[PDB]
Amino acid sequence: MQEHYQPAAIEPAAQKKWDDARISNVSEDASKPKYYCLSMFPYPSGKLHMGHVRNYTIGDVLSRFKLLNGFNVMQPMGWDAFGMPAENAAMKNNVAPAAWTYDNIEYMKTQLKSLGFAVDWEREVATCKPEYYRWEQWLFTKLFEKGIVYRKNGTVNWDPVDQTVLANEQVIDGRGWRSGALIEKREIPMYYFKITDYAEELLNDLDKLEHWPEQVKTMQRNWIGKSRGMTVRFAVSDDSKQGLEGDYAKFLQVYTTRPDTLMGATYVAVAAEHPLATAAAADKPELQAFIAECKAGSVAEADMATMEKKGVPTGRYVVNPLNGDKLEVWIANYVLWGYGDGAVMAVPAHDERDFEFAAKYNLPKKQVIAVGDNAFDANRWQEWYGDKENGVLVNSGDLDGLDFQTAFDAVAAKLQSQGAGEPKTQYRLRDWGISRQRYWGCPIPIVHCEKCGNVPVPADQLPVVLPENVVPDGMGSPLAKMPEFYETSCPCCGGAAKRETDTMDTFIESSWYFFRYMSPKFSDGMVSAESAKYWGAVDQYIGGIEHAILHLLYARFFTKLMRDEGLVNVDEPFERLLTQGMVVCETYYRENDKGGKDWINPADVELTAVLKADGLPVVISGTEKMSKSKNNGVDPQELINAYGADTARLFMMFAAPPEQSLEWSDSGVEGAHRFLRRLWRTVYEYLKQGGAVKAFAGNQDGLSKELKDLRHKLHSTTAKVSDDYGRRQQFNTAIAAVMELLNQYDKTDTGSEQGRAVAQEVLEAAVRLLWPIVPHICETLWSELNGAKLWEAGWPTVDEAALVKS
Ligand SMILES: CC(C)C[C@H](N)C(=O)NS(=O)(=O)OC[C@H]1OC[C@@H](CCCn2cc(CNC(=O)c3ccccc3)nn2)[C@H](O)[C@@H]1O
Ligand SMILES: [Mg+2]
Ligand SMILES: [Zn+2]
């Protein structure tokens, strides 16, 4: 055993030791209890960043902890390979997205291996390979025939300069983010998953996820947005029926979740596309311009509430069916066509958005709810205005004195008896649009035949292979310009037909990959029945909070779809969920010659803050998440090259709890490396005193008080670390606990015969308690202390007798 700790001399040897023993290569072995620990697989972007290292170190800590406790642990890794980054690098570097992807995969796989993650690489998947996406094409065809996947026209944002479709996030002031050209709204046929058919299942099954953060489940409930409200029909006044057709000439239908406040409606609002808006705008040009501006908007869902609410009056009126009030119809920008009836009522006294809307236009506010003896001021909104449980009705005629649920049922009775309304349940959730006008994605297995219609590709002909010999040029997605791809024969009639050229939303690959890991080479289905029944569901899932809504919902949706097809037998894909925090770092910049800022990487800066190149000052700016935006990313490969994998892993687990943001710190890195030197020196100095002995065990009567105190600290540390790994999942406090054990060990004279035995017991436990976090150095130090295989010695047991004081 060498005196000094040298990671480059031990880390490759420890990795070869694990790989030779195949401790991470697992099968469906019924002799050991399974454990499925999964970290969200990465985009093969080029190289790992610090977020990857934190996520996969966390997953490796939990996996190795369960491994030491005797579980048959599967920790798989793969590549979410489809998407736009490969197309953009293709347009910048004149390479094929496939070639760019596969080279990134090879390099990033080397980095992951150098970090010592206990990963079953024999289960690796690449989602851009036909052997993977053939099965999501298969599920697509099966659901398309059942109507769960359907085709209908939708509206997209067309950029005519870049010749591409853009998301709402890519539109700024009505113009493309890169081209700067005005975007055009176009109706094109697209495919949709009928996810609203599973809305009630996806909402209620969240209650089963006892080991998910309540934050994530709340976000999913709000996204699904179930409401039990009332359909209310307002009869159109006789003086307001010009230009109206059908039922729109008879009544205005609306949906409200507050029918107990129907006596407090002071106006109604309709969407820009509503027929009442169209009829009233046929004359007035200001209404036409307001309708045009609403349609030209491209506001994303995450900013819908922040959008300034505006409206225009129409001069048309409707009648409240409960009190006969004649209310004016307004066109408003917050009423969205396709959501319910595309029309709402407004009770400014008990809905804060209606309050601010009415306060802006001086529209009437009428109180209909009272809570205690609270004072109502029509000029200032108070939180009790919207109270839905402790409120009682006022100014509502025959409904006065009722609470929410009683007034709800009475209003429903009044409306139904006169045919003016009925109860109704609504969901904010929209159907899942999966069509993408992009090349680097999974082809949609549909053939268009003018005789047979939109025909799904048969199962024998799957997959529809995406050609990899493609370099996108920019002037449109190349698939729609490659007759060698889309020209084909109809699988139903053999006649001339055309393949679909749109590709799938890349969220689809990530919606079922956790199942594919169970049998990644199975060629007769998405997942083999024998492996699905063994591994069941993912026991532990680790990823970033940015996937709390869409990805998780999609994955839960796919699981229930695959269960209904009979491929799996679990209702939920992920039992436990851990959301890791961001990795942030200081920023540095120099002022431009044009009044701007040039952002400088931290690796090119030395703190006396001075640029390393010319020794000239640099401005220290705010700390934020690492990104290429302000050029503040710290390359983990340089951290590995300079300190080793164990130092990188230890710093990430010690700097902050997994949920809390991790602040990059040079001294924090150095403190981690110096602790590994201390651990190395501790075992070296111990073995230099007389070599290893048998660790203390059994009756501790007769041990000195100092050695009894060390054993108490030892097994209290084991219980604390076990609770930190297994229950709390706070790895920073576990490292501190082992440090406190080593501190007391340093203060204890362990030179006697019984002292050596206790010292052996301390060090054998300490290297095993830290093995999940820093396995390279712990595997090396364990082999110097004991000749048994560390993974066969197992997780340290707590000696209860060591915790009983006299
Ligand atoms: C399941 C599917 C849907 C996952 C999907 N393929 C994915 O998110 N793949 S992914 O490759 O993007 O990420 C894979 C997993 O590990 C990383 C987590 C990142 C969380 C956000 N973050 C990032 C940072 C730090 N950035 C840097 O240092 C940096 C950045 C840019 C340039 C230079 C440096 N700090 N926080 C992800 O959420 C996920 O769990
Ligand atoms: Mg349960
Ligand atoms: Zn045909």
Tab-separated table of C-alpha atoms in Angstrom, residues 22-39 58-77 117-123 517 534-535 537-540 542 771-772 791:
chain	number	residue	atom	x	y	z
A	22	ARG	CA	-20.119	-8.365	-13.132
A	23	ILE	CA	-21.685	-7.037	-9.931
A	24	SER	CA	-23.771	-4.572	-11.976
A	25	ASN	CA	-24.781	-7.051	-14.713
A	26	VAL	CA	-28.074	-8.434	-13.407
A	27	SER	CA	-30.635	-10.948	-14.659
A	28	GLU	CA	-34.214	-11.787	-13.657
A	29	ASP	CA	-32.962	-13.843	-10.711
A	30	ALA	CA	-35.749	-14.940	-8.358
A	31	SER	CA	-33.262	-15.778	-5.580
A	32	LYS	CA	-32.530	-12.168	-4.595
A	33	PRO	CA	-35.067	-9.352	-4.113
A	34	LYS	CA	-35.085	-6.981	-7.071
A	35	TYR	CA	-34.410	-3.263	-6.851
A	36	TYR	CA	-34.837	-0.902	-9.810
A	37	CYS	CA	-33.008	2.412	-9.359
A	38	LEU	CA	-33.292	4.701	-12.381
A	39	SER	CA	-31.878	8.123	-13.233
A	58	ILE	CA	-27.145	10.357	-6.514
A	59	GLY	CA	-28.502	7.356	-8.403
A	60	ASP	CA	-25.252	5.469	-7.833
A	61	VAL	CA	-25.251	6.195	-4.082
A	62	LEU	CA	-28.739	4.715	-3.721
A	63	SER	CA	-27.966	1.787	-6.036
A	64	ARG	CA	-24.747	0.780	-4.270
A	65	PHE	CA	-26.484	1.167	-0.899
A	66	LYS	CA	-29.176	-1.310	-1.938
A	67	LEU	CA	-26.485	-3.506	-3.504
A	68	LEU	CA	-24.655	-3.724	-0.172
A	69	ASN	CA	-27.961	-4.641	1.506
A	70	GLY	CA	-28.369	-7.758	-0.649
A	71	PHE	CA	-30.713	-6.486	-3.367
A	72	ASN	CA	-30.549	-7.530	-7.024
A	73	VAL	CA	-30.031	-3.977	-8.252
A	74	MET	CA	-30.673	-2.858	-11.827
A	75	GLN	CA	-29.276	0.608	-12.599
A	76	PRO	CA	-29.541	1.094	-16.370
A	77	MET	CA	-28.371	3.951	-18.562
A	117	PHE	CA	-21.212	4.270	-11.809
A	118	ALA	CA	-22.444	0.732	-11.080
A	119	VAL	CA	-24.419	0.572	-14.325
A	120	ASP	CA	-25.657	-2.494	-16.219
A	121	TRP	CA	-24.245	-1.476	-19.588
A	122	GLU	CA	-25.560	-4.701	-21.142
A	123	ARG	CA	-29.027	-3.078	-20.964
A	517	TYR	CA	-34.556	-1.519	-19.954
A	534	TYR	CA	-39.962	-9.627	-12.347
A	535	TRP	CA	-38.831	-5.989	-12.292
A	537	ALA	CA	-42.085	-0.898	-11.467
A	538	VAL	CA	-39.186	1.481	-10.907
A	539	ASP	CA	-38.433	1.536	-7.189
A	540	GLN	CA	-36.476	4.810	-7.272
A	542	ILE	CA	-34.105	10.553	-9.846
A	771	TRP	CA	-18.485	2.954	-0.441
A	772	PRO	CA	-21.772	4.113	-2.092
A	791	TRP	CA	-20.110	-6.610	-1.497
